[PDB]
């Protein structure tokens, strides 16, 4: 019932500001603080501070000591954390969480938002299926999502309703600065011709919202 | 602030193991002490607060004791989904501090690596690239070798490789060698295979297919 549900992910340039939200409900709004982590791709958490709801209260750490600014809008029980002027270094998730009354850990926290602070230009994938293949056994068949910027790309099968033996890998980057992955599935052979199978391609930077229907070769 | 040192930075164990990690503080606090657990792809969750208090929730399997400044997280019997690296954080001080947080990696029996290849795509090659991409899926251990040979000769670094996580239910990995070519040195070549060596094959098995060939 307690939820923290944190706005998506942003992709800003040097020098531009930002303001990433956090919603609490399930739960009184003003009864509890609520706290920033940030955590850099790669490395560990960092405590960026703590905040009361109801009042001026505010605690952070040194590093981000007059970096950045926690604040609250008690009428939507919705939390903030902004900066003036972004820097490369910025890029990171940013989880905000709820600190337990009587304690300082965080009870909950919200499913983080990705901030990514760079000159370099946006560009949609390009997506392309990868084809299976007296018969059957095991096939499989997927989808190369191509040439992107930056992180993160969506890969669903069937609108999600193909779960299991699911694997989208890592995004590599290669030498032209560009992001490529690949998103696979292993299937029963049976299935090749009777069941038909689409890969749901989202690149939200650039509005990308791609249908690739994965069928069979010849 | 107050320093948190955990420790290993990384271990592995078997299924049904006892694990167990350690957090030190560069000074006393007390038992202000909270354990959490980050999946890759996650955020992190509650585990333990106060030192040793388990949060509602968790299973029982995970503890936390120690005071002062030495405290140790402990799993009695390890699971799969346990895959994770898991951060202490102190709370006796402001700022509230974590550790760089340990990978636990799960150990199990050897599995071999089932190997697919998959050709360039039709419209891909409209679009004057072509990449072929070899799968090797679900596989232990991580320690696999990947080999492109085109026309017979062997090929150097022409290919980028990715890997997945632990599976949360098999502890196995998958990766996808991808060579990338341009259609135009592409069409040069006849014979695109990837040749895998892994602990659990008895001997390399090489996946191959010929250029346009329905």
């Known amino acids: 019932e307690v939820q923290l549900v944190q706005s998506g992910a942003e992709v800003k340039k040097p020098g531009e500001s930002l303001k990433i939200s956090c919603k609490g409900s399930?739960?009184?709004?003003?009864?509890?603080?609520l706290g920033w982590v940030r955590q850099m791709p790669g490395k560990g958490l960092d405590w960026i501070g703590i905040?009361?709801?109801?009042?001026?209260?505010?605690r952070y750490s040194p590093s981000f000591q007059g970096q950045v600014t926690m604040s609250v809008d008690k009428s939507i029980t919705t939390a903030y954390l902004q900066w003036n002027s972004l820097k490369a270094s910025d890029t990171a998730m940013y989880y905000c969480?709820?600190?337990?009354?009587?304690?300082?850990?965080?009870?909950?926290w919200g499913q983080g938002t990705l901030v990514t602070v760079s000159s370099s230009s946006t560009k949609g994938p390009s997506v392309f299926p990868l084809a299976p293949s007296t018969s059957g056994g095991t096939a499989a068949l997927g989808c190369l999502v191509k040439d992107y910027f930056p992180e993160p790309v969506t890969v669903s099968w069937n609108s999600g309703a193909l779960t299991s033996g699911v694997h989208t890998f890592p995004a590599v980057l290669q030498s032209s600065g560009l992001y490529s992955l690949s998103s696979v599935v292993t299937v029963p052979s049976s299935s090749l011709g009777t069941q038909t199978y689409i890969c749901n391609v989202n690149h939200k930077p650039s509005n990308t919202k791609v249908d690739k229907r994965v069928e069979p070769k010849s | 602030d107050i320093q948190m040192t955990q420790s290993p930075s990384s271990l592995s164990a078997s299924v049904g193991d006892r694990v167990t990690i350690t957090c030190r503080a560069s000074?006393?606090?007390?038992?202000?002490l909270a354990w959490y657990q980050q999946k890759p792809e996650k955020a992190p969750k509650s585990l333990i607060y106060?030192?040793?208090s388990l949060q509602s929730g968790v299973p029982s399997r995970f503890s936390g004791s120690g005071s002062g400044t030495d405290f140790t997280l402990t799993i009695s019997s390890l699971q799969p989904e346990d895959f994770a690296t898991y951060y202490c954080?102190?709370?006796?001080?402001?700022?509230?501090?974590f550790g760089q947080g340990t990978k636990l990696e799960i150990k199990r029996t050897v599995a071999a690596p089932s190997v697919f290849i998959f050709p360039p795509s039709d419209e891909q090659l409209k679009s004057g690239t072509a990449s072929v991409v070899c799968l090797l899926n679900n596989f232990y251990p991580r320690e696999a070798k990947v080999q492109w040979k085109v026309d017979n000769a062997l090929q150097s670094g022409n290919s980028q490789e990715s890997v997945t996580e632990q599976d949360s239910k098999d502890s196995t990995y998958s990766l996808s060698s991808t060579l990338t070519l341009s259609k135009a040195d592409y069409e040069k070549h006849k014979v695109y295979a990837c040749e895998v060596t892994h602990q659990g094959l008895s001997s390399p098995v090489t996946k191959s297919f010929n250029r346009g060939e329905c």
């Open positions: 905040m009361s709801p109801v009042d001026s209260d505010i």
């Open positions: 954080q102190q709370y006796n001080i402001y700022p509230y501090t």
């Open positions: 399930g739960y009184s709004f003003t009864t509890y603080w």
């Open positions: 000074q006393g606090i007390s038992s202000w």
């Open positions: 969480a709820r600190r337990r009354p009587g304690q300082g850990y965080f009870d909950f």
């Open positions: 106060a030192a040793s």
